[PDB]
Amino acid sequence: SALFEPYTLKDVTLRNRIAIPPMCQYMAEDGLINDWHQVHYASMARGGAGLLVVEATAVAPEGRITPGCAGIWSDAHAQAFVPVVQAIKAAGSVPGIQIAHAGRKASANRPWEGDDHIGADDARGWETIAPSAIAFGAHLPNVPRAMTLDDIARVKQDFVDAARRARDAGFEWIELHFAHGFLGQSFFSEHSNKRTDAYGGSFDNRSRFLLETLAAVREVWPENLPLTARFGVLEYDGRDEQTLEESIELARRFKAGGLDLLSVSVGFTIPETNIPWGPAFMGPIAERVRREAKLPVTSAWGFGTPQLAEAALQANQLDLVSVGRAHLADPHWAYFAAKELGVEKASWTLPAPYAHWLERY
Amino acid sequence: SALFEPYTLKDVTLRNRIAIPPMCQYMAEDGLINDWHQVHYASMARGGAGLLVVEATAVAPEGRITPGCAGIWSDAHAQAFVPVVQAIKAAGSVPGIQIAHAGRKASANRPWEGDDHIGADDARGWETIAPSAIAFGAHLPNVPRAMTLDDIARVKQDFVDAARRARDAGFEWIELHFAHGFLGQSFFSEHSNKRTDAYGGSFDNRSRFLLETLAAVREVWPENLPLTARFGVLEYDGRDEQTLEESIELARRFKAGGLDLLSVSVGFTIPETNIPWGPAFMGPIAERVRREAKLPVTSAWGFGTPQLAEAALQANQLDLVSVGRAHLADPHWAYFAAKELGVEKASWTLPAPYAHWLER
Ligand SMILES: Cc1cc2nc3c(=O)[nH]c(=O)nc-3n(C[C@H](O)[C@H](O)[C@H](O)COP(=O)(O)O)c2cc1C
Ligand SMILES: Cc1cc2nc3c(=O)[nH]c(=O)nc-3n(C[C@H](O)[C@H](O)[C@H](O)COP(=O)(O)O)c2cc1C
Ligand SMILES: CCOC(=O)/C(=N\O)C(=O)CC
Ligand SMILES: CCOC(=O)/C(=N\O)C(=O)CC
């Protein structure tokens, strides 16, 4: 089964092609993770996935999405991740982390607590930042302040500091969150970036924040550990042909800047779109990025059945299959997949205290 | 769905009828649980089960099955369970514990490391105790030492101390392990109990260790928290009708002694048996014990599908359905069952960080 072949990238070897993509839990306090996260991540790692990318972790307080988001903006925040890193490794999985800045989508309620921008008189809310003073709209009406050049320098340094903290906490894989309408994606998109300086306008200028952030992180993140990014390559906004061509060109420049693998996603930069949700719908687009930019890729958004995952690997559309919600439903999804794909000794996808009994069940 | 109706026993209310029965993990060291157990129990509790009975926990070192078994024979051992109690409660489940003594089946290798008695030359092993100096046989050939009267008093006190520790660690449900061929079951069974003193021979004498242990635990375990036991009610040894009748009579005595619920199982006292493994096969026997002894019951051994579990409750064969191996496969099995049984807002069987997204 292709899904259960190992994968080597730099000094990291994953035991299979099942990756758990970053999934915010909204359970942190002042950026500090706790026993929610410890059990959540350790249990999924024991389930058999080869790579576990920890949820979007804010590089700065105002870069959280919500008051429940994890942060890594201080050394104390980084130290809180050490037991998570070590528990993932103890389970035989590889610990990664996505470092992030929510941009104009920040200062929002948890999804089950309204999912919308926090009211201005609520002490929990904060002023958001973005390339331009333009609101997302819909449930996120707050207008961000437009970043200064000093803000751009500061946020880049926050990404650098976060990457060095992640390295010292023991993460073996890093993902820069340049997708999903957050700060990096919003610098790239003409919908959200109306700047008139070196960071807006032309393709080079709109790419600049992302390329400079990557280059600054590349200095501090080790060459021997995968340096990855998540990027929304189209918006489903009626501009898909031109946006794909630009996004693929940016992927080529990411590769020239030392990126090892690209997590291919959707932009979600504005609400006025028509995303054609369906099983494995990103497969063909991820394959085009992989082939045209000549970089390994992962993707998500509907690959969460064993056969869909296997087919995407056999078609060389992906190098790793990211399976998110299925792992919230069943932390042992990798074992479920091993059974469904007929892996020999499938129960030994799990540790011995489970595997021994399930072999004979 | 009957499987998702709450259950009240004494002061405890379970959010549904799904119980996770005790399942040894073989991952402790010197009786002390660790990160293996912490994540294992917390994750299953978040999965939605209403009751989580922690694995057989030895009341004394020689009462472990293996060198990896949990213990509660000191106050430090009990404190190690506190974070497990807290995590189970934080998930909205109810924490229970099975306290145990493996008797002649003790001093064995872990199941994936041979599953057999540790050899006499191997310093990891220890001398085992039992009612009589007679081996289980098969893969457990070591002949135990027959307990002295002082040994019997000591083991009873160990059960008392274990129950007191479980109480003060915050467990809300206790289960005495009188099943599965271990010490308590082996006092009851004529196969293993050849004693000629007050603890063997007649029905009263064979029951005595179990009834005295229950009574001693009763003096320390709170009246307002369920006091339960697991007991093998037949062996499938060609003596089933007589063994069932006297096991049910003992259950009546347990009831009179304050037992709140009986986990009905098989004896496993000797290897020479013919157990008819199959889906929900214990249903009819559990129902007979429940009805004849007038005690609430749970059982296991093949109820691990949503429809089998639901059917057993609708038929009033069980009060709680114990689902073991399915929770090792999927620690969110209760959520899987809620979906299968058409529970409204089934995803909210899980906590919010999962439930919100799975609803959509
Ligand atoms: C609860 C939840 C939280 C998420 N948080 C993140 C995140 O922190 N960073 C990110 O890039 N994507 C995040 N996503 C998107 C997922 O990584 C993934 O792309 C999505 O769940 C689709 O994959 P699936 O169909 O296998 O669930 C999240 C998704 C969910 C359901
Ligand atoms: C790994 C494992 C460990 C077990 N440990 C215990 C135990 O500590 N105490 C006990 O009374 N039964 C124990 N059992 C028996 C189970 O509680 C249960 O009766 C059995 O798994 C059958 O239920 P199931 O068909 O739902 O798995 C164990 C079973 C398994 C698979
Ligand atoms: C809908 C696109 O946005 C996401 O997938 C997401 N959370 O839901 C994140 O990226 C959190 C950082
Ligand atoms: C300096 C080179 O940049 C370009 O010419 C360009 N657009 O202006 C593209 O590459 C389109 C993606």
Ligand SMILES: CCOC(=O)/C(=N\O)C(=O)CC
């Ligand atoms: C023979 C059946 O015995 C069991 O089910 C069991 N473990 O497998 C225990 O009870 C451990 C205390």
